[PDB]
């Protein structure tokens, strides 16, 4: 009950109540919130509420201080002094963008900008706030029943009535019951249990509504420029291999924080792992959102690091398959591998915080507090895809908003820039590098002469509002049977239902662009599906061709998007 002020630190008994997150407003900042807002309930030992039995008076400004206790004006004592005068809220030890981050739904893209916009402790109010709306959004759904049993990767759901069917796709993580977390994409449904169960009738899956903790770390710590490296020790035999990072990973001892921007391919797990090998003494944590993200560093390390000096933090609660050559849960290893989720609270040489365009706030923070580093390394990309903002339904998430790194990245530039893609065939470097690296990104190989095109807008048709186009896949049925070296691509679309569709009609293995992220593959066919401004996403776009190493098949259905392709046109 008795705190810091979110806004300007003043101490104060107050707190906001029709706030979500019940922030401390101090006297001034708490009126100015109250007399702006519909939040007139404020809260202190005692809540500001009328005294007087069985009356119903809440608001801040319809009361007063009857000597030591609180009335309303109907019955208040003739000596009474009102709780709202002289700007401000009475209380112990006597803005506009702190009362939108209060009352928002945060359906608006406006919202999240604001969200990155606003000062260092309106970050953690909105990233803490956000969360919790999100969190209790998840008891708005329905709950579904298994009512049959088909085979051991295929049921029947029964829903419930009255409340709202979430999106059915890999990214909605239900909690079967405690029968393990489930997954489903599609009369007949696929059912994915990360716990291995003979599926129960009558048994049913709620939501993960997990509780959201408050941030006390700041998304960025305060920068730190040094004269010399830091508390890390270089080596001189710096293998050549790694010697291109060389200035980068001086530049990381050199200062408190440091942001790599690395287009696909262009190096940053090998940037990642050779800052272990420049500083072989250095602890260092390795951390990203994903299991898939720290995975892929795991991989990188297996190939240079010790791997006695190596381990992989499982959390206990084993969602999915992940990384098995590390000794797992050893906390005190030089290097640790940990998803931002499952991070124990410990301290580092380094911390390298991987996939960074997909971090919120929230996650920035989180990272802030359970490590303290004498360095911090943000890797990533603000031109590829985002964390999914759930509630976001009006308006779109712009790169410099996605995050605080990002937004430094995106208006200061980025610390660090890998220029040249060594994955891609250069047709898709000069494609990307024109679109979203302002001309900055370079092709290491040549151009492959294997980048289709086809311009095919089909048929949309829709599985409640994921999108399927038969007619594409037609069209790519029709090009494997010419082209049947493209037999062992990958499919991928920006649609799961899509995706479903080509699994069964051409046999290709399937992945969604935003699944496809950090992911490379010889051969790639992409088809656009439809032209909405999902499918149309720059940063999605990006992502979706830049997993090609030899060759892709884009049929695409947006003009703009198949005219700025660098690939040869096929006809039909
Ligand atoms: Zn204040
Ligand atoms: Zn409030
Ligand atoms: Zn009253």
Request: with cysteine; aromatic share 10%.
């Given at each position: 009950a008795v705190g810091a002020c979110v806004l300007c630190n003043s101490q104060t008994s107050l707190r906001c109540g029709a706030c979500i997150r019940r922030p401390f407003l101090?006297?001034?900042?708490?009126y100015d919130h109250v007399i702006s807002t519909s939040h007139k309930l404020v809260l202190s030992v005692n809540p500001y509420v009328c005294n007087a039995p069985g009356c119903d008076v809440t608001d801040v400004t319809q009361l007063y201080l009857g000597g030591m206790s609180y009335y309303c004006k109907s019955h208040k004592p003739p000596i009474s002094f009102p709780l709202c005068a002289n700007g401000q809220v009475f209380g112990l030890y006597k803005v506009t963008d702190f009362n939108a981050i209060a009352t928002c739904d945060w359906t608006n893209a406006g919202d999240y900008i604001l969200a990155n916009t606003c000062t260092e402790r309106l970050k953690l109010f909105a990233a803490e706030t956000l969360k919790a709306t999100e969190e209790t959004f998840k008891l708005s759904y329905g709950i579904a029943t298994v009512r049959e049993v088909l085979s051991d990767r295929e049921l029947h759901l029964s829903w419930e009535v009255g409340k709202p069917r979430p999106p059915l796709n890999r990214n909605y993580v239900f909690t079967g019951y405690q029968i393990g977390e489930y997954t489903f994409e599609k009369d007949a449904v696929v059912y994915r249990g990360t716990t291995t169960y003979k599926l129960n009738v009558g048994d049913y899956f709620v939501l993960t509504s997990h509780t959201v903790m408050p941030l006390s770390a700041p998304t960025l710590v305060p920068q730190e420029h040094y004269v010399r490296i830091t508390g890390l020790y270089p080596t001189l035999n710096i293998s050549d291999e790694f010697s291109s990072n060389?200035?980068?990973?001086?530049?990381?001892?050199?200062?408190?924080?440091?942001?790599?921007?690395?287009?696909?391919?262009?190096?940053?797990?090998?940037?990642?792992?050779?800052?272990?090998?420049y500083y072989p003494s250095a602890r260092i944590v390795y951390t990203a959102c994903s299991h898939a993200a720290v995975d892929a560093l795991c991989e990188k390390a297996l190939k240079y690091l010790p791997i006695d000096?190596?381990?992989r933090i499982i959390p206990a609660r084993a969602r999915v398959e992940c990384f098995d050559k590390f000794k797992v849960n050893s906390t005190?290893?030089?290097?640790?591998?940990?998803?931002?989720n499952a991070l124990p609270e410990t301290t580092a040489d380094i911390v390298v915080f991987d996939e960074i365009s997909m971090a919120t706030n929230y996650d920035l923070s989180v990272v802030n507090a359970r490590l303290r580093a004498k360095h911090y390394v943000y890797i990533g990309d603000p031109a590829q895809l985002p964390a999914p903002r759930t509630l976001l339904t009006k308006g779109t998430l712009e790169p410099e908003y996605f995050n605080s790194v990002c937004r430094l990245m995106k208006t200061i530039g980025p610390d660090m820039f890998l220029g040249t893609c060594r994955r891609c065939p250069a047709e898709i470097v000069d494609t990307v590098s024109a679109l979203v690296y302002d001309n900055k990104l370079k092709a290491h190989k040549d151009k492959s002469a294997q980048c289709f095109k086809m311009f095919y807008k089909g048929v949309i048709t829709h599985d409640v509002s994921s999108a399927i186009n038969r007619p594409q896949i037609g069209v790519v049925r029709e090009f494997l049977t010419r082209?049947?070296?493209?037999?062992?691509?990958?499919?991928?679309?920006?649609?799961?239902?899509?995706?479903?569709?080509?699994?069964?009609?051409?046999?290709?293995?399937?992945?969604?662009?935003?699944?496809?992220?950090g992911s490379e593959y010889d051969y790639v066919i992409f088809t656009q599906t439809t032209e909405t401004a999902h499918s149309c996403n720059v940063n999605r776009f990006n992502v979706a061709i830049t997993r090609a190493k030899v060759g892709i098949l884009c049929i695409m259905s947006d003009r703009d998007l198949y005219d700025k392709l660098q690939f040869t046109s096929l006809e039909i």
């Open positions: 101090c006297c001034k900042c708490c060389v200035a980068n990973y001086q530049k990381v001892g050199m200062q408190k924080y440091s942001t790599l921007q690395g287009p696909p391919g262009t190096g940053k797990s090998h940037f990642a792992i050779g800052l272990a090998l000096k190596c381990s005190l290893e030089q290097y640790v591998f940990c998803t931002v082209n049947p070296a493209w037999r062992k691509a990958v499919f991928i679309s920006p649609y799961n239902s899509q995706n479903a569709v080509a699994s069964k009609i051409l046999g290709l293995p399937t992945q969604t662009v935003d699944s496809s992220q």
